[PDB]
UniProtKB/TrEMBL annotation, chains A, B:
It is a multi-pass membrane protein. Its main location: membrane. The keyword Transmembrane applies. Keywords: ATP-binding, Cell membrane, Kinase, Membrane, Nucleotide-binding, Phosphoprotein, Transferase, Transmembrane, Transmembrane helix, Two-component regulatory system. The keyword Magnesium does not apply. This is histidine kinase. It comes from Acinetobacter baumannii. It catalyses: ATP + protein L-histidine = ADP + protein N-phospho-L-histidine. Its EC number is 2.7.13.3. It comes from the Bacteria. One of its GO terms (molecular function) is ATP binding. Residues 1-197 form the Histidine kinase domain. One of its GO terms (cellular component) is plasma membrane.
Amino acid sequence: AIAHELRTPITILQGRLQGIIDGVFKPDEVLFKSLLNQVEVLSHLVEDLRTLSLVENQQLRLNYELFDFKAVVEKVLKAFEDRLDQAKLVPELDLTSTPVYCDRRRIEQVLIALIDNAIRYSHAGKLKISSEVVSQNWILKIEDEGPGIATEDDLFKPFTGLGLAVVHAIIVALKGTIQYSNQGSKSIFTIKISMNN
Amino acid sequence: AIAHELRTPITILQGRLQGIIDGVFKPDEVLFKSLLNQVEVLSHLVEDLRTLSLVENQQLRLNYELFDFKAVVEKVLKAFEDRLDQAKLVPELDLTSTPVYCDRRRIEQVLIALIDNAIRYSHAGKLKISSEVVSQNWILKIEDEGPGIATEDDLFKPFTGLGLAVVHAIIVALKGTIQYSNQGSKSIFTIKISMNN
């Protein structure tokens, strides 16, 4: 356990730094940008690891409230607008107007991670975001036109990596489940969260 | 749990990198050296975390063998010779000549961590390293002339940090215990490892 898949961005950082010292790389603005981006990758990894370790010990503080999911969707889609266009992912919204009772920032986290994975893996095309409320059950579907995964699960297994593991951990912390479907033409993530206690 | 005490060397790295981008730091050799050293600190932290997580799940592979402890002491003291002299720590050896049956690299790890903590915390003076074998029990004492710690333990608690936590975890993995004593004038770590099964 678990873990040391993050021991590689360090090493490739080390050598990179050493590459500037041994005299093979000239320190320009792009070099500093790349170093900063690698450190950001490590920060993403340690944050996701912190979240996982919080969930595994039932110490993840939850704050329930009644909120409008469409606003969170708008926020997360504007935070990814340029990257969405660079991947040619056009969001498609089928969001209900009735609010939901859940944790705002945790749902925002899972949405950020899911659309990040979509931008990084899905094919260029429509991005379906649907949210329905079916008798004290809130279903949220993320569908793409891109490819999928088929293995006897290993999807929510760990390793911006292991984001699906954090999604699954948060969904477990909430009163909900998550399922994945790969119909060849469509790849769909479904999150079912019970509202009634 | 646990953990994110390593989320700070990242941030101070980030800003540091950003400091070169915003135009407040000139990228010289000392700057690259400092960046490389910060990345090395993060590497040390992730390695110690990997070791702790291996121990906490009883997945830490052990390789027992009969070895001479004085050779390992010589190796680790030569690996720290310049830093030992820079801290004015003169090693004092009271090592027995009879070999011991244990894990070579794990004992080397705990010795590295302990003398690292000594160089970083102990006062300038004698560094007593003693090793006796008392009827199927191997006792290893590290004594300094520096200060100590007094709190109702929190010594082997985590956070080059949390090295004492790794020392304690390895000692637990081995068939041994570890105790700490602070007599004001002397600070002593004692490791008692049973040889007979």
